[PDB]
Amino acid sequence: RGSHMMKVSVIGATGYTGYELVKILANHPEFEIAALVSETYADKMFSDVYPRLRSICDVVITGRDYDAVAEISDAVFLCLPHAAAQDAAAFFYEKGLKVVDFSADFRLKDKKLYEATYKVDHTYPDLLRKAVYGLPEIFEVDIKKAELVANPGCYPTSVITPLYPLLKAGLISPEGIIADSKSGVTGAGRKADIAYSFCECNEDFRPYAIFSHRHNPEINEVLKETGKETNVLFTPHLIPASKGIESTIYTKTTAGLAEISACLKDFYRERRCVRIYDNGHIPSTADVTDTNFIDIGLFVKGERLIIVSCIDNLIKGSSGMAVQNMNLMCGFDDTLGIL
Amino acid sequence: PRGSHMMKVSVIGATGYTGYELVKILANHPEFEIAALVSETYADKMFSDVYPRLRSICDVVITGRDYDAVAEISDAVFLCLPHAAAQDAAAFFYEKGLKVVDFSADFRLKDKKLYEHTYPDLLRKAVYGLPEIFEVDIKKAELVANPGCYPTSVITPLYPLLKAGLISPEGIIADSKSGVTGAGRKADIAYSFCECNEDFRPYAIFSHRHNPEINEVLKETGKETNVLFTPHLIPASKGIESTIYTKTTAGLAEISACLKDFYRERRCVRIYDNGHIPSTADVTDTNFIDIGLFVKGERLIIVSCIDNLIKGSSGMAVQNMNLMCGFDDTLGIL
Ligand code: NA
Ligand code: NA
């Protein structure tokens, strides 16, 4: 209704995650957009860059003035790349804003692991200790008290969410897990690279980053929080489609389907974004594209458990989760303005 | 140009996507010459009425299912017929002395028990037509079962490694992905443009018919495997990629040496061990199988890519026919 209105800004607003985030913020009943920052498209209206939003979000894009942003905003979403994200997050944090950082810079509590993976130095160790990993259906208790939240990566969301309760309850082995995952091309971001051009990706399907994708350590670092050390092997693939992630996950269980289903449905019992199937239904990316849902299908044969996990990469894998995090930091329901 | 060793060949069930790709290859083949193209649905239409891309290339008039007429004008026949029909046709042309390649599954598994099958005597005689492995058996046969498309991408890289004992036979996982042409020319809502476009999905979990095919054939290595196979539908027309997870004790150089030695004379097999990752666009519209190899500690990851309608079907079928007819297996392909 506007009674608990808060001003929110987006830094790095013209990438694909910024577009999905603005779409949500525009219709959110308590967040009011204050600034949309992009150094490249400054002095243009957001609807000049994204004409689909003409007459819905016509806010004039401004340049990088962080003092300007802090003085007009209660909260900021950072869609910046690494390193720049650290400086901005640190600035807006001490100014007293609520901060959601899309980047990886504050996700990994282990500083050397970060520097080794991202090949850049981490210069805010105390802030790194304070940041909360933004998986709303798992770490809600901690997010509600946070002022700095590291938004999870898109592939880690699709793999962590179904595995977390089963590891913690001891129903699957922590060793030998294979996640064979596939994403739409929007996962590369708004890029001019030849490798992301239409003619190179259209009709093509490929693995990439074999034994080397920066999300594999994130998955295993977070799942350690279940009390069990994991060695998930993660391999991504590029789908000739704009949006959508599917993860096929292979595990070993001593339990039967009924117990595995009860563990997941009990753990996610109040979480409207989590849709769990145990009846033979197979999630596909079209079931979750343009939604904030995560769909999980369960299949058991003997000791083999296969999990199919689907999300929209830009919404449950990024912007929608970012708004759930912001909702939670602001005292709102996690699904406010979402579903 | 007609060749000095010309032979006549017919195609039964010619108007599906496998028949289309097969006709493309036959029309350019320097020795095979098309005699009949049979399709009860499109009889009395020219092949290029169904596939206008082939206009002025293959304008052969399609005929109905009169198998005596085919046998009288053909030295050999390709059967792209559905289950059961394929059994009677292959029994007929075998009696009449024709070389036969059957695209269906009805003659792939020697063990009748897995099928449950009429013609059990004939089932004994059918040869599994994986040309880069069973060449010996193929040349001496009169009935070949063309292998399935997914088994082709998975058996081919795993066979030598199991035989040489370089990977474990237990615990192998094949996570495989295919273009929609793998469903054949069908009027099903599930295969419509609007249902498949922009969508990606696993299917047939724990239940795809190609998965016992993979394991039955790999038993010929001397190893009892339990390959877990899961297929997925790509929103693209053609192409298979198989990501294969194995356990090895051997190093990259040894695994590579095994594969490149076992396939050293086989021009359709392209093996990479240098970090190059194959993609479906590298093999689409070709008869190549591209294999990438990746080792970390005890983990071997294999990436295997084919055109599902050519190397996984029609181009392989012409390899099998070439071999049965005394030609080099890549004649008219490379
Ligand atoms: Na709003
Ligand atoms: Na020809």
Residue numbers in the entry:
A (entry chain A): -4 to 334
B (entry chain B): -5 to 110, 117 to 334
From the paper:
To increase DaArgC activity with formyl phosphate, we aimed at improving accommodation of formyl phosphate in the active site by introducing larger amino acid residues in key positions to close up the active site of the enzyme, excluding binding of the native substrate. We targeted five residues of DaArgC (S178, G182, A183, Y203 and L233) and used iterative saturation mutagenesis (ISM)26 to screen for favorable amino acid substitutions. At 50 mM formyl phosphate, WT DaArgC showed an apparent kcat of 0.1 s−1, but was not fully saturated. WT DaArgC showed a turnover of about 1 s−1 on NAGP, which is in line with activities of other ArgC homologs. While we could not observed major changes between the TGAGR loop of DaArgC and the TVAGR loop of DaArgC3 in the NADP+/NADPH-unbound state (RMSD 0.119), it is known that in mtArgC29 the GAG motif moves closer to NADP+ in the bound state.
Here, we seek to establish the direct reduction of formyl phosphate into formaldehyde through developing a new-to-nature enzyme, formyl phosphate reductase (FPR). We identify promiscuous FPR activity in four enzyme families and present one homolog of N-acetyl-γ-glutamyl phosphate (NAGP) reductase from Denitrovibrio acetiphilus (DaArgC) that produces relevant levels of formaldehyde. The ArgC active site can be divided into three parts, the NADPH-binding domain, the catalytic site, and a substrate-binding channel. The catalytic site consists of catalytically active C149 and the HRH motif (residues 208-210) responsible for binding the phosphate and carbonyl group of the substrate (gray labeling in Fig. 3a).
